[PDB]
Amino acid sequence: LELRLKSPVGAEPAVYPWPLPVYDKHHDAAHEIIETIRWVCEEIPDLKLAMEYDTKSFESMQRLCDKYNRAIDSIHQLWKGTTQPMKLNTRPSTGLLRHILQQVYNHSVTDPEKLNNYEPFSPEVYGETSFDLVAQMIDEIKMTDDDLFVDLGSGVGQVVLQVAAATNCKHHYGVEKADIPAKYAETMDREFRKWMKWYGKKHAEYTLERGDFLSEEWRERIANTSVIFVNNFAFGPEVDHQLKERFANMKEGGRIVSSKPFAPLNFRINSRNLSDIGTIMRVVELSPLKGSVSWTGKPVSYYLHTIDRTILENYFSSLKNPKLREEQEAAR
Ligand SMILES: Cc1ccc(NC(=O)NCCCN(C[C@H]2O[C@@H](n3cnc4c(N)ncnc43)[C@H](O)[C@@H]2O)C(C)C)cc1
């Protein structure tokens, strides 16, 4: 006994055995099926029109699947007529992408318990993943095809995949040091590509790698990245310090988005702090997403750092000008 869902673009059908597997306490294949149908119906209005359940009854679930499959066949017949078929070159909506990543994770991370010891993957937010927060980041931070993107410490790769699905960066990378998450990343990658093809959706190029971002090789790679995401909230002093030294080699207009700032928000340059990272970057607290919950109980905010050496330039200009020099020397 089994259930099948046809792909809206003619990829091979999704096939689930009956009884439908359970993935964890809040996820199972029955609701994966229901949500797939719901999202294919958002992809294709005509299907939504044609569509109007006991998830423990094989007959109830077979009837839903049959109704979806017959509607997909009719839509495919419609597209052989004069109706234009669904555009094949598009990015997924945030809602669809959320479903896709959950589906990819369901099928990739076989034993969620093996991951526990590499926690936290989302230390900045109580009770949810970074997904909704990253979806905001992505809309605030303009990225283009000149950009290279990296998630430093990428886990099973979920944030890299989300950004690659939504943006035009030339390449997206994840780097992950631990064996278990890195190995799950390899499956996440194959599953993601499979499911994105199944929905008829495109993503930018990406690569998930094994490695330590504090290594010597990564030194020059960080220097040549234009957009770095790093979830550093729970990092200690020495790692944050080591990262600051890597960032000091980034090019002007390079950006770092993090869960804890790497410099104070109102850094004031003076003769004792001249070599601190604050001398070369604007730092701002981004708008928090309403509804998200931080450790304080308030909405979570991320931190945007933009490499901008005009701050340092202006300090040196001011040291050359006796009036400006006396003012500076006055305060401090
Ligand atoms: C705003 C903002 C939001 C989200 C994100 N991205 C994000 O959440 N990605 C998911 C993984 C989170 N990672 C933990 C993983 O890092 C590895 N890791 C730790 N140190 C590492 C290292 N030195 N080298 C490679 N991997 C490392 C650990 O083994 C662990 O698998 C963070 C918490 C570090 C970025 C920016």
From Swiss-Prot:
Places the protein is found: Nucleus
Annotated effect of mutating T90M: Found in a patient with developmental delay and intellectual disability; likely pathogenic
Binding-site list for S-adenosyl-L-methionine: 126-129, 149-158, 176, 212-213
Domain DOT1: 12-320
Phosphoserine PTM sites in chain numbering: S287
Domain of life, per lineage: Eukaryota
Medical condition linked: Defects in DOTL1 are associated with an autosomal dominant form of global developmental delay and intellectual disability, with or without one or more major congenital anomalies. The patient phenotypes are characterized by central nervous system (CNS) dysfunction, such as mild motor delay and significant speech and language delay, and a range of congenital anomalies, including brain structural anomalies, cardiac defects, varied urogenital features and growth restriction. Variants may cause a gain-of-function effect leading to an increase in cellular H3K79 methylation levels.
Miscellaneous comment as given in the Swiss-Prot or TrEMBL entry: In contrast to other lysine histone methyltransferases, it does not contain a SET domain, suggesting the existence of another mechanism for methylation of lysine residues of histones.
Subunit structure of this chain's protein: Interacts with MLLT10.
Function: Histone methyltransferase. Methylates 'Lys-79' of histone H3. Nucleosomes are preferred as substrate compared to free histones. Binds to DNA.
Family: Belongs to the class I-like SAM-binding methyltransferase superfamily. DOT1 family.
Designated name of the protein: Histone-lysine N-methyltransferase, H3 lysine-79 specific
Source organism: Homo sapiens
Upper taxonomic lineage: Eukaryota, Metazoa, Chordata, Craniata, Vertebrata
